[PDB]
Paper text:
Recently, a fluorescent protein based on an anionic tryptophan (Trp) was developed and was named WasCFP. WasCFP was further improved to enhance its stability across a broad range of pH levels and temperatures, incorporating 13 additional mutations. This improved variant, which exhibits strong green fluorescence under physiological conditions, has been named [name]. Spectrally, [name] exhibits green fluorescence (λex/λem = 493/502 nm) at physiological and higher pH levels, contrasting with cyan fluorescence (λex/λem = 429/475 nm) under acidic conditions (pH < 6).
Residue numbers in the entry: 2 to 64, 68 to 231
Write the structure that this text describes.
């Protein structure tokens, strides 16, 4: 793939999410720029249906691993860019410990020069009085590793990781992520050796924005293969 060639400069990003958590329907739209050369994404997300019925931090992982910086010695392990421009399906289940689960399905592909992430999210079995529907989570940076492995049989990848969400009482809400990505196209893709993506995030508010929103500055770096 000259999949990788589509990411050498700054790429416009569009995100669309339709969600239903315990029957509470909502939509999010996002925009920004990705600069994979520096593993960088600069984003702003809007709840387009009024108030988000779940905390922003619970949606971060759902709301474009194609923008990761793969060091030169690891470029042969970059499935995500290899599937472009036709794109990939990203499916997850996220199990929130002692609470509900999200099931997500996304299509990540180019529409002309724009990288588009279209997402549907279904959440079930949440506690109306719990840390999620009760909005008891810190609005603070998420960082850490996404472990990537080949899925030869599906010509794709699997991923797993646990996110540790800070709770306002000082406890941690564990969110166990199970991920499967498959190419949309039937052209060849790169099936990687085991590695991980290391994400560093800064999250903020726009003081002039009245809509429920989230501003993100993300840096994502492939790692786990030496040299």
């Amino acid at each position: 793939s000259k999949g990788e060639k589509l990411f050498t400069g700054v790429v416009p990003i569009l995100v669309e999410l339709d969600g239903d958590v315990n029957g509470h329907k909502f939509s999010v739209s996002g925009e920004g720029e990705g600069d994979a050369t520096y593993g960088k994404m600069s984003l702003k997300f809007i709840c387009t249906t009024g108030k988000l019925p779940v905390p922003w931090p619970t949606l971060k992982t759902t709301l474009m691993q194609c923008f990761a910086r793969y060091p030169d010695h690891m470029k042969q392990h970059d499935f995500f860019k290899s599937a472009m421009p036709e794109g990939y399906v990203q499916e997850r289940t996220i199990f929130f410990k002692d609470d509900g689960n999200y099931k997500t399905r996304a299509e990540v592909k180019f529409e002309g020069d724009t990288l588009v992430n279209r997402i549907e999210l279904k959440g079930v079995d949440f506690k109306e009085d719990g840390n999620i529907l009760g909005h008891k989570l810190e609005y603070n940076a998420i960082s850490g590793n996404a472990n990537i492995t080949a899925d030869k049989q599906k010509n794709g990848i699997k991923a797993y990781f646990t996110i540790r969400h800070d709770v306002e009482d000082g406890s941690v809400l564990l969110a166990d992520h199970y991920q499967q990505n498959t190419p949309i196209g039937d052209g060849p893709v790169l099936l990687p050796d085991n590695h991980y993506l290391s994400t560093q995030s800064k999250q903020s508010k726009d003081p002039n924005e009245k809509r429920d929103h989230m501003v993100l500055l993300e840096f994502v770096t492939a790692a786990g293969i030496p040299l």
